[PDB]
Design a binder for this molecule. Sequence first.
Ligand SMILES: COC1=C2C[C@@H](C)C[C@H](OC)[C@H](O)[C@@H](C)/C=C(\C)[C@H](OC(N)=O)[C@@H](OC)/C=C\C=C(/C)C(=O)NC(=CC1=O)C2=O
Ligand SMILES: COC1=C2C[C@@H](C)C[C@H](OC)[C@H](O)[C@@H](C)/C=C(\C)[C@H](OC(N)=O)[C@@H](OC)/C=C\C=C(/C)C(=O)NC(=CC1=O)C2=O
Lengths: 206, 204
Amino acid sequence: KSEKFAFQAEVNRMMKLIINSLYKNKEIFLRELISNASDALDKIRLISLTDENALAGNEELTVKIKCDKEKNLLHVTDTGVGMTREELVKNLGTIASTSELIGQFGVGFYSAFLVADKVIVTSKHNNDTQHIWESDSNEFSVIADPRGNTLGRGTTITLVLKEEASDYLELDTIKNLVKKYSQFINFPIYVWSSKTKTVWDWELMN
Amino acid sequence: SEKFAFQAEVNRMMKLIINSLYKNKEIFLRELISNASDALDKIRLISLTDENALAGNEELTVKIKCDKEKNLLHVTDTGVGMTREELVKNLGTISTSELIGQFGVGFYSAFLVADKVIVTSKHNNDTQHIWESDSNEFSVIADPRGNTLGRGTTITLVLKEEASDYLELDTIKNLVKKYSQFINFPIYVWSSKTKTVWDWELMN
Ligand SMILES: COC1=C2C[C@@H](C)C[C@H](OC)[C@H](O)[C@@H](C)/C=C(\C)[C@H](OC(N)=O)[C@@H](OC)/C=C\C=C(/C)C(=O)NC(=CC1=O)C2=O
Ligand SMILES: COC1=C2C[C@@H](C)C[C@H](OC)[C@H](O)[C@@H](C)/C=C(\C)[C@H](OC(N)=O)[C@@H](OC)/C=C\C=C(/C)C(=O)NC(=CC1=O)C2=O
């Protein structure tokens, strides 16, 4: 189980706070994830200033959100700097209204457990191979992605939604939320939506 | 090397117990008394083949102590006890009311009323040690007070505010009785009588 890890005590306590104090406005997890994605794009953009190889694995700088209503999943993918394996283990397993306090203290990512029974973070960084981080909140593991490098560069956050969080699978909801929290993000944010013959394509939200 | 993490299974188990028994929480005492009884049963067996078994403490009892000022509830038995290695493994790894005793996870029902649970235990083959937890981790350290128990274990609960009622004597006596009526070992509750004096009171 050299791939299995446990959470630092403080993180456990922190996840417990978010759940007990934000259960009346769970929709903020989308805000927090879109915000994280945006900070990630800012860093690769900052890296491309000095390193001229920074953007060779994925020239674009976007944020695409997809709804798999059949597998009960919600995907949020950015083409930011991404995270190395060691960063998945250290930065997600430890740390150094409360709606505003979370993003400021650096723990807004855990707001995802407000609507998910399981969170998965797939990531490719310019200096490592693609890896997968998974957790149901009672432990977590990190393994090399057997699919190889399918992201180029960036991160995908996958949420296996709670049955009560089923509404986050309907497009009308996500679009409303994506739009409401995409307002001040300096990057384009699309949503895989239907157009009704009935064809699917990326739809710009901001 | 004094702070450990709970195994994933235990984590899952604590939540289940807490999510499903929030309606009948008084169960926690039944579970502690029951465990106390098992412990006593085991030292008694050992005393059959081991003449030195009861060297550290000749009695086979279970004593319950309420401390309102400090907000603590103590459950002490004089059974076989637990060695440091056992506290670590047997506690960190593994109506449903009567379904938890079966699986052997009753202990955790203590978190239904306690923000923090402490386990002090002295086992014939080791020195006294202390296991503490708030459910988000746990730690095991050598008791700096020495071999104070002689032999056995003390379950100390730092009761939640909404658990203020288990601090009241008449309540514990009432509860300790309903569940001690089946244990073949004497259960006492440090009670009081009005001058006002304190002394053990037999419940079964
Ligand atoms: C200031 O940076 C932020 C930090 C500090 C730190 C961990 C940054 C990280 O160092 C490895 C990378 O530099 C950064 C580019 C990676 C992301 C933003 C990831 O998101 C995507 N899309 O990559 C996010 O994944 C869930 C990382 C964990 C987030 C946590 C625990 C959180 O709750 N809040 C945080 C939000 C932040 O903005 C946070 O702690
Ligand atoms: C069958 O034995 C029981 C086990 C198996 C096992 C761990 C037994 C233990 O092995 C080291 C000792 O042999 C035994 C004498 C010690 C006690 C009963 C302790 O209580 C006192 N007073 O000593 C209790 O402390 C909280 C131990 C943890 C209890 C757990 C996790 C539980 O939830 N249920 C259990 C109840 C049991 O009866 C249980 O798992």
